Amino acid sequence: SVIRSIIKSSRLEEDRKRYLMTLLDDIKGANDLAKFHQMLVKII
């Protein structure tokens, strides 16, 4: 939910936050999620 919320709150990727939502929501790894979060949030 944490990462799911941030990407959904990421006002840049429309369909990509939607797509990445159904992806990350399925990501059952807390550490890997955090890395994906650090990833895109450092991208922007």
UniProtKB/Swiss-Prot annotation:
Sequence segments annotated as region (Interaction with the nucleocapsid (N-RNA)): 1-44
Annotated signal sequence range: none
Lineage top rank: taxon: Viruses
Post-translational modification: Phosphorylation on serines by host CK2 is necessary for the formation of viral factories.
Chain residue ranges for the region called X domain (XD): 1-44
Function summary: Essential cofactor of the RNA polymerase L that plays a central role in the transcription and replication by forming the polymerase complex with RNA polymerase L and recruiting L to the genomic N-RNA template for RNA synthesis. Also plays a central role in the encapsidation of nascent RNA chains by forming the encapsidation complex with the nucleocapsid protein N (N-P complex). Acts as a chaperone for newly synthesized free N protein, so-called N0, allowing encapsidation of nascent RNA chains during replication.
Record text about domains: The N-terminus consists of a long intrinsically disordered tail. The central part contains the coiled-coil multimerization domain (MD). Forms a four-stranded coiled coil structure. The C-terminus constitutes the alpha-helical domain (XD) that binds to the nucleocapsid (N-RNA complex).
Assembly information from the UniProt record: Homotetramer. Interacts (via multimerization domain and XD domain) with polymerase L; this interaction forms the polymerase L-P complex. Interacts (via N-terminus) with N0 (via Ncore); this interaction allows P to chaperon N0 to avoid N polymerization and non-specific RNA binding before encapsidation. Interacts (via C-terminus) with N-RNA template (via Ntail); this interaction maintains the P/L complex anchored to the nucleocapsid template during the sequential transcription. Interacts (via C-terminus) with protein C this interaction allows C to associate with the ribonucleocapsid.
Family (UniProt): Belongs to the morbillivirus P protein family.
The protein's name in its UniProt record: Phosphoprotein
Lineage: Viruses, Riboviria, Orthornavirae, Negarnaviricota, Haploviricotina
Residues of the full protein shown: 462 to 505 of 507
